[PDB]
Ligand binder design. Structure first.
Ligand SMILES: Cc1cc(CCCOc2c(C)cc(-c3noc(C(F)(F)F)n3)cc2C)on1
Ligand SMILES: Cc1cc(CCCOc2c(C)cc(-c3noc(C(F)(F)F)n3)cc2C)on1
Ligand SMILES: Cc1cc(CCCOc2c(C)cc(-c3noc(C(F)(F)F)n3)cc2C)on1
Lengths: 29, 238, 252, 285, 238, 285, 29, 285, 60, 29, 29, 29
């Protein structure tokens, strides 16, 4: 599952696995 | 299935890549995060804190607290030089300061530096000192007159024991290398007697001075790299 | 006047007419444990004014050859009234502190003390392989430790002030909550630190959260050396609470 | 705009630094350059206060200086060796008491903080050296044995069944194995330092060894004995993700000696034990 | 086709991964599921059920039902100790209980424990006993006075044969290791005579007591691992 | 919210544990700590009832203790060996009567329930040992022969055609083979235990062997005879998916002896046959 | 085929094969 | 239309050339063919002005002549050699002072501009030559050491831990490694030429060596010593992306001699040093 | 996972390909671009400028 | 994340990595 | 090209190649 | 980028590369 945003420039922020530890580097701020 | 084209780079392992990967502990729920004072989110918060410069680190002083103090005293000749160091954030008298250590984990730096000095003589000891910054393109000043032609602060010792000299970012390029590289050599900081060290009778004829360094609001580091201020020459065992 | 201070804790009040402001470690004021961060389920005991008061440790003499002194908390208060009793009758304890270091001389004296509060100050041993500092050496009590004196036993910790007794450079201690006592400016230092740990409460007997380190960075000098210049430390717990009551633990 | 947020991540302009404004000559009894370091606070004076500055539009960003970036790079933490010399059954498997204390480079970085909380990404780089010529078909098994689980004592121990433990099987010729681990402590954060003991006697242990038990990493060559002997060296790399750190501290100034301890060696000429370079005198740049 | 980048980890086999895979029996329709009493959805349901503690497991008792009973009797000295065990869920007198066996499949535990005791003397046998829990940081109590200073229940034997002592979760950290590891050693449970074992004439001068254990609403286990309470030293054959 | 549902799965907070509420001193004739174990019910007393507790906000979750998680990890269930010693035709193929009884680790876990219904994920880890040097091009064939289908008796038996049976071909150098199997019983659940026979005479068989016939796994090296001999060991791993279990039971306390039976061995000193450790006496912690 | 949800954070829950036995671990509760 | 924009990219018709219009005979005192080259401007006369042209619809496009296209092709910039001859420890690792001056083909193209700003795509082509027969399992490590970072002096130097530096590990048999690098200068653009020094004395250095320090590329065979010696040659390719160039200049006319300098050799018969071919005379085509 | 079909060409390295690739310097922020006179965007701009022909290039 | 356009002929202009240096050749003009 | 259905549980029935012979097993009934 | 059509049976006609020569066989008629 992933978070889709729109403005048009969509930001498909996918998370391929079912665990939080699996995702990549965090966002800053 | 979906026709795909495997691109160059596939299968490689880049230590700085940012990929996702399966979790070895599925269903595991981490311990709830509690509040702990002192959280750091960016290393800049550490570069903005003053730390002492081992400015008097001669061979006979290293390994002693005296490597952090500069001695002042009544002079017989006028306008004598007190100390002189390169201003490069990772150059050597200040490489081991906190900001110097952090700068040593990056390749580029930019911004203004804040140098502070605290006088530690008696309350009855007076003194006026000239702190000067000499921009690059010239040798270190050989006299007070030559030094005061550059950026400088005349410090008068009094109730407030500390003074600050800001070394403005004056460079041709937007950044400089943190490692000792001539082209991006930032200049010097020198200290001279503006008047003299005066004391009344029955008072110590010498006094110490402490030197600090930190970065200003425009300080910034770039391009992470490994440091050369620490090494490992053998296995670290149990 | 910004150079005067009065600190009241319980039935104790401390004053100084030559301070250099005060420091609040990490900008966080001490407070009681909240139910969202808590883990132990029994109701805590909060001695309030009978424990949150100033306790004055033994004084130390500062001379031209002094190398420094250090104390560990809560160890330094293990024998201090109700606070001390509570840390041995309970498994868990939690507390913040107001550390007030006192040292006066004269307008004809000079010297500078660096006063630092270090969290998790894990001491080192020197040239002794993997042998670590022994329990009794890091639990000196109110007497603390006078750098440069002890009789070298094996589990004796490092006595190198320039390496912070832990392998790091003295000049960088300023990254921790600290103040300076520069005889020409002030005669006291005041640090207020909150509880800092990766767990909400901990064993007051096996774990020392903070370490008070006092290093003379500028030698004490004057033309009246026969006059002894002491250094006195007064510490006051804040929001002290304990949990897991039982019989009193007897150490060593 | 969560899309405006994204453009900033691609360009790495999330944390911008302030501009320098134009300043002018001044004459007042407000002296910003003067202060008192005794207070324990850093003088907050900026360049506009000491010299006459021009207006400059800063473009620098602090993104790369973030804690996530500083600790978010894979570094080596262990080099496992399986060297077949004369007994396959005894030399084809081994174990390692997990920790991040054996390699100076990453250890020093994490130890610039007192506490840290993060998830881990482990990447393994196995390399098979042919001592006699061929390498055959090498298949490796890396098994995580949490504290308490049975540790294998032979290459065919029942513990290798891995009925509940996590195991990663790697086949020579396939990509480097990799997986994530969630924050594992029983506390809210990992202790980089610990001024405590596991008891109150002269024989109690001191330091992080008391709080940082991570279990054991057991590995073996799955392939059965082959005519030609090989030497398999598996290097383990670690990277922190979703990081948080508390209470920064002075960087390690002397070489490390052992794991879980701040102990150090000192020679007769100490200037050789630290990175400080002796100055000729106070005025020799 | 679609350009792709093969990431590290590809091709590996992680025993705890969670991927999909083709079915070897396409079109196959499983047998309809019927209702069966006793379904379990979470192992916590098993940790909440009492099981006997082989508390009297001395070498001469193991292999006998007597390893599950504690004998009580008229005392000649006051405040005598009846039994003492570590409270750690996977420590040894209680490692083989159901909750102990399950805890042995996990690395971490948390929550409160429920200890129950059932008196098995005659209906005319009376007794008062003190059950105490001693939080960590101190040795096991050496006397009733020392023990009653901690958490405890004074049990009066009567029409209701069973009593329960709850060992509250009192720890520094949110969790503890299930395996015998000092740092996370949870304390002790001791039992002492509060008064005495009294009986009228012509009645057995001794009686047994059964001990149970289970977890409270806050009990919880974490990080699955293999158990050391069972092994295989040879092939299991047909 | 099916999206709110998803956030909980990623964080593993689907099954939360209750909080501890503050309690107060009490004096009443309602005595919760007193009860009767004879009833067969566990006293439902909680900590708030015996001591004065504070209010604590629990964050723990039971997700990892779910049956799906407990039985949802791949464990070894068989180690097949094809060892070429002196006759390729006879040694290049073999068969195995499928079951989950040969490896103690996973067997004990499933046997903590009386009945269980689940789908299976089989993963195979083949490893080719070069006994003479080279391995050539190894291609393997694993074929599932359901009860009743013809079992191959030679490496070229017609049954290897696999006209209807499921076969998986693996080529050395390619990823580990894997596939799923749906719940296979002719009943609604698998029997972990079965107190029954396949007849009513003194010679009738007893136990799960009567109900758990899963067929045979036949395998062979597809590659024809090569100059250099190899030893191929294929390890089979099993994992349960979409699991349901009924009627929990006591865990196996002694070593297993044989498949499909609860039989056990007992030595002269029984304390050595169980995990129970002898206590010095009742008061020695 | 897969079940798409929206709130925006879409949860694309894909099932790549045509058999139920093929999918990964089940949801809890 | 951003979609109309896309169709043009696929067809490569983003930059079209103008059409030729029909012109007619003329007689005037406006003489476009006449001008003054002294002005330093090129006469802007077009074909319609000198001859009578027809109308022609131009289809040509300039896309391929764009700077992005001209410098956007991977070319070799270095050939690293690791030749195992008689000492594995000394011959299994090496280093290279990074630059784009060693290979004439790409160097000449970039030097057709004074300044250039671009991101880089590095692709590596490793090839292992078997000097004795087998190659075993070759695993390589390429590490970028920015100026200032510690340079490894042995194959087991602690610097290989790569705690902060970027390293790429490649396994023989896997695809060619590749990665991107952002514009790295401390200035706004790279200097293709630099008429300056790093000082003001007779011993100061001159040229781009003063401004183009890119650090070092350290590489080693990760695999430990094997019986059979190999010779690994890794060729590095570079390509510019998102390019901008300023102030075009004359192309290099003679062979290059050294890196970072415009120095050249001249023989006794100079016509052999340049691409100019001697003409028999002014009228011999 | 998603069933895929690896096409011919996969794994190869074409010097003129146009693919994306991971960045070795994450979080790095390039120096701000300043204005420099003389920017060239297309080589045609250079072909439109006169240069001298070495028309009398005899050997002497 | 990627920029989706429509007219129907959608131009999914994907950027697979989180850095600008990672993308392919630039657009002209 | 593929047939997308909605109800939300979308059934993306993809056909990766341009020939009918290329697709998988047929639907029943 | 690709041309999406709808009727529901969507025909995602993808063109994975930026050059016309890169696409597959042409449509007839
Ligand atoms: C502080 C602090 C934090 C940590 C965690 C370090 C990570 O250590 C590991 C590693 C490196 C690997 C595994 C691991 N899990 O599964 C596997 C395998 F079996 F696939 F190898 N290895 C588990 C831990 C806790 O250590 N000290
Ligand atoms: C109770 C209970 C439940 C089960 C099922 C165990 C799974 O056993 C198998 C295995 C391991 C493999 C196959 C299988 N199907 O196809 C193939 C192959 F040909 F690809 F190997 N192997 C079929 C069954 C029933 O056994 N006992
Ligand atoms: C002008 C100008 C511009 C440049 C940059 C040239 C690119 O040089 C490199 C190369 C080729 C590789 C790396 C590199 N980064 O990481 C790695 C590795 F470790 F994966 F190899 N190599 C870094 C730079 C600056 O040089 N001169």
């Amino acid at each position: 599952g992933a978070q889709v945003s729109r403005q048009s420039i969509n930001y498909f922020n996918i998370n391929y696995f079912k665990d939080a530890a699996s995702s990549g580097a965090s966002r800053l701020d | 299935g979906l026709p795909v084209y495997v691109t160059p780079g596939s299968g490689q392992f880049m230590t700085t890549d940012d990929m996702q990967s399966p979790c070895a502990l599925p269903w595991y729920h981490p311990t709830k995060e509690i509040f702990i004072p002192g959280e750091v989110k960016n290393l800049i918060e550490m570069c903005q804190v003053d730390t002492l410069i081992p400015i008097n680190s001669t061979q006979s002083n290293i390994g002693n607290v005296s490597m952090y103090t500069v001695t002042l005293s009544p002079q017989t000749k006028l306008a004598e030089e007190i100390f002189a160091i390169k201003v490069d954030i990772a150059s050597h008298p200040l490489a081991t300061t906190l900001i110097g250590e952090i700068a040593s984990y990056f390749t580029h730096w930019t911004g203004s530096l804040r140098f502070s000095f605290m006088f530690c003589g008696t309350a009855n000891t007076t003194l006026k000192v000239l702190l000067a910054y000499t921009p690059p393109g010239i040798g270190k000043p050989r006299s007070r007159k030559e030094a005061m032609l550059g950026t400088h602060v005349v410090w008068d010792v009094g109730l407030q024991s500390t003074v600050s000299l800001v070394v403005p970012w004056i460079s041709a390029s937007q950044y400089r290398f943190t490692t000792p590289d001539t082209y991006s050599s930032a200049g010097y900081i020198t200290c001279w007697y503006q008047t003299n060290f005066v004391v009344p009778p029955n008072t110590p004829n010498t006094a110490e001075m402490l030197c600090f360094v930190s970065g200003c609001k425009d300080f910034c580091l770039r391009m992470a790299r490994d440091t050369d201020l620490h090494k490992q020459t053998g296995p670290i065992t149990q | 006047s910004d150079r005067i201070i009065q600190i009241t804790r319980g039935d104790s009040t401390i004053t100084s007419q030559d301070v250099a402001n005060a420091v609040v470690g990490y900008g966080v004021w001490p407070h009681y444990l909240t139910p969202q961060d808590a883990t132990a389920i029994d109701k805590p005991t909060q001695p309030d004014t009978s424990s949150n008061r100033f306790y004055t440790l033994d004084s130390k003499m500062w001379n031209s050859t002094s190398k420094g002194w250090w104390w560990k908390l809560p160890d330094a208060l293990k024998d201090m009234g109700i606070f001390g009793e509570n840390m041995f009758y309970h498994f868990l304890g939690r507390s913040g502190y107001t550390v007030h270091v006192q040292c006066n001389a004269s307008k004809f004296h000079q010297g500078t003390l660096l006063v630092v509060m270090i969290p998790e100050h894990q001491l080192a041993t020197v040239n002794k392989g993997n042998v670590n500092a022994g329990y009794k050496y890091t639990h000196p009590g109110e007497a603390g430790r006078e750098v440069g004196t002890q009789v070298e036993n094996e589990k004796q910790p490092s006595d190198d002030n320039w390496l912070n007794f832990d392998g790091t450079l003295l000049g960088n201690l300023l990254i921790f909550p600290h103040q300076f006592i520069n005889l020409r400016s002030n005669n006291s230092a005041t640090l207020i630190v909150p509880y800092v740990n990766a767990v909400p409460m901990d064993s007051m007997v096996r774990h020392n959260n903070w370490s008070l380190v006092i290093i003379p960075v500028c030698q004490l000098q004057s033309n009246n050396i026969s006059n002894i210049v002491p250094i006195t430390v007064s510490i006051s717990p804040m929001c002290a609470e304990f949990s897991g009551a039982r019989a009193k633990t007897v150490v060593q | 705009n969560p899309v405006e947020r994204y453009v900033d991540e691609v360009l790495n302009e999330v944390l911008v630094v302030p501009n320098i404004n134009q300043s002018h000559p001044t004459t007042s009894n407000a002296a910003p350059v003067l202060d008192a370091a005794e207070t324990g606070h850093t003088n907050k004076i900026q360049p506009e206060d000491t010299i006459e500055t021009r207006y400059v539009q800063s473009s620098q960003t602090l993104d790369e200086m973030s804690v996530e970036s500083f600790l978010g790079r894979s570094g080596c933490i262990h080099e496992s060796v399986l060297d077949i010399v004369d007994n396959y059954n005894d030399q084809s498997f081994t174990k390692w008491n997990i920790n991040l204390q054996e390699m100076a480079q990453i250890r020093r970085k994490f130890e610039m903080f007192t506490y840290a909380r993060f998830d881990s990404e482990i990447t393994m780089v196995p390399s098979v050296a042919a001592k006699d010529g061929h390498i055959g078909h090498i298949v490796m098994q890396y098994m995580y044995v949490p504290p308490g689980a049975p540790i294998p004592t032979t290459r065919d121990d029942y513990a290798w069944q891995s009925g509940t433990n996590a195991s990663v099987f790697w086949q020579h010729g396939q990509p480097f194995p990799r997986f994530s681990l969630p924050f594992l402590s029983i506390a809210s954060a990992y202790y980089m330092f610990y001024d405590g003991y596991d008891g109150d006697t002269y024989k109690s242990r001191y330091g992080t060894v008391v709080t940082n038990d991570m279990g054991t990493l057991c590995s073996r060559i799955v392939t059965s004995e082959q005519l030609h002997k090989v030497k398999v060296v598996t290097r383990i790399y670690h990277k922190a993700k979703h990081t948080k750190a508390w209470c920064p501290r002075p960087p390690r100034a002397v070489q490390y000696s052992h794991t879980h301890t701040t102990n150090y060696k000192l020679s007769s000429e100490v200037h050789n034990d630290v990175a400080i370079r002796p100055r000729t005198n106070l005025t020799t740049v």
